Design a protein around this nucleic acid. Sequence first.
RNA 1: UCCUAAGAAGCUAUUAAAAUCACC
RNA 2: AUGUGAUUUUAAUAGCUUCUUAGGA
Lengths: 131, 513
Amino acid sequence: AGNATEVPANSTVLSFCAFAVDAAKAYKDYLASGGQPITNCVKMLCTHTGTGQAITVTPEANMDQESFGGASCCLYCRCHIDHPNPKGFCDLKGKYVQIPTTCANDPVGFTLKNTVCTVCGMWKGYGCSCD
Amino acid sequence: AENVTGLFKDCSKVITGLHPTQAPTHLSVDTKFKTEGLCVDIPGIPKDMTYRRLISMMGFKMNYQVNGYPNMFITREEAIRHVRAWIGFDVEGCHATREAVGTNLPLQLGFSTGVNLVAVPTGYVDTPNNTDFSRVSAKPPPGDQFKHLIPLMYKGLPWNVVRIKIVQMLSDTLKNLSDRVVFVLWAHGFALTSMKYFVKIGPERTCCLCDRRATCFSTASDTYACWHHSIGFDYVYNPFMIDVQQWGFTGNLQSNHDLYCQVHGNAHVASCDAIMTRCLAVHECFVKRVDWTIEYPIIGDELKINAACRKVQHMVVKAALLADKFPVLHDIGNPKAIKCVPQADVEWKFYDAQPCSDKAYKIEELFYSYATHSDKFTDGVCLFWNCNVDRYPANSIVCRFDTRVLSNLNLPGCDGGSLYVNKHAFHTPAFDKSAFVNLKQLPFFYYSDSPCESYVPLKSATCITRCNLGGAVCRHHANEYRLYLDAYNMMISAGFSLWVYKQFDTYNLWNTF
RNA sequence: UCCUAAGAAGCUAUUAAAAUCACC
RNA sequence: AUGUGAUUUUAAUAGCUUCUUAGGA
Ligand SMILES: [Mg+2]
Ligand SMILES: [Mg+2]
Ligand SMILES: [Zn+2]
Ligand SMILES: [Zn+2]
Ligand SMILES: [Zn+2]
Ligand SMILES: [Zn+2]
Ligand SMILES: [Zn+2]
């Protein structure tokens, strides 16, 4: 009964992150001390030619960006706990995340540390051009 | 079963899957989008905006190793060292029947404290925008083995009132015992599933407004507390747990408890499986023999109670020896050879239970049982100090711990006997009257051969000294009598009970003068 | 000495059914 | 469709390896 969702490669890091008073910090500390990233993310076979933006309704991927499904780049949607965002609603769930391909072996650990530029929709420091 | 696990297993009954976005993993996307391990964005199929899917929090695996974060599960050489912080735990479940099938939400939680907490069936329903922890529909388990969960699903409390009556019961039990909690579990598979609801592990933290380890988290006001300051704190911070079934046990719980204990019963109720799970785990660690290597912290009166016992044991043995002039005096259960009254004439045969780490004094090895050795020792008197034999012979000086007295020292244990953890762990058996059918109680008295030297005058016939027999009671023995009375009352408050042979005569001490 | 087809054996993996044990 | 696993078997299916037969080089 039921349709399985996880793999046994994740069931060490997800369980440990299900119980945590601060879910982002515990995942960063799991990554530091001999930790493999969360596998089995949802990935898009996009046309891979599109203007880069962090969060979009359809995947718009730059030549240096892998576009993942936005529910597997959110640790809280992925551990099934409550988002720390006020009004408790996820911003990434329902839209497509664009992760730079140099750091796209670990999508979940990118959206925890990085941020979205409010005035041009790019990953701040990863192509936000506001000099 | 191709590299999948039962954890977070979507238990909804909708035939379709999930959109490419709003899907947690690659295995949850529907078949319409999944092409060569890379999901495709079909602009035709829109995304679900109203759906609820009961995620199954079953199969947690706490095998992580992170640097700052302590491990939940402990080794049974680190759980025997924390025996004051054992709280058994058993969780009864209810199965999800309507609009979700495939996960057991928790219904009834039970601890070794003796407290059953019913909860409403509540599960983690994954809505489009968040994980909505909320009530799901459930049916109680099938069969006549579970029929007392038929009424319980029509009562109970929400999980924000059964999260604060777990940190009000643990905090009132372990306020004075220890500063952590060791959840002794039978089968951790469902106890972990039922600990997603009230446990937040995290880095090793320190209490607010205080200096003790931080063991209680408060989600409303984001602070931590030790077991004293946790008024209103709802989430249990780092617990430790232990699985008794991973100690090589084959069979049911009531078919592994009922071989050691005939006092507990009524299995498959949560408060009576969490008691058996701790009964079995106290037996398998402590009932074999006292382990003299593992010291224990000092909760309170550990220095005074032990020294008072040594003081009264030095007195009663010497008094009975000088009063009745026994030719030989045996000894049983004395691990080392430490002569209580060394300045004596009797031959101290150390009929110990087993030789313990020294033969420098040639302690003999002998085990005692009533039907075996009722007529083996006939000569003299046998000092059964803190022995645990079924019945004592007709000539002895016995000091048995009365296991019906409850304190922060005397933790509950196996077969109605209890674990008296005072600077060591002694699993003393049940205090039955049948052990003392050959003995009587001991009067209170003080006897000394010390000559008298020159405040309230005290006249009590219990004290045995030539000064209290005269008109004036000296100040060289009044404080001695008061110290001895204090030691005796502290001993009796601690829970011991002295017993002596039939022909013990307190007037026999007088003719010694 | 090498490639292909069929048969047999062994190992591993995927689905299905049955049996045992634990949890409920 | 009514709960969760774990281990064995018993069927098919897939892959690899070994042996036998046949065809070719
Ligand atoms: Mg149980
Ligand atoms: Mg039970
Ligand atoms: Zn999210
Ligand atoms: Zn910018
Ligand atoms: Zn405190
Ligand atoms: Zn018992
Ligand atoms: Zn005196």
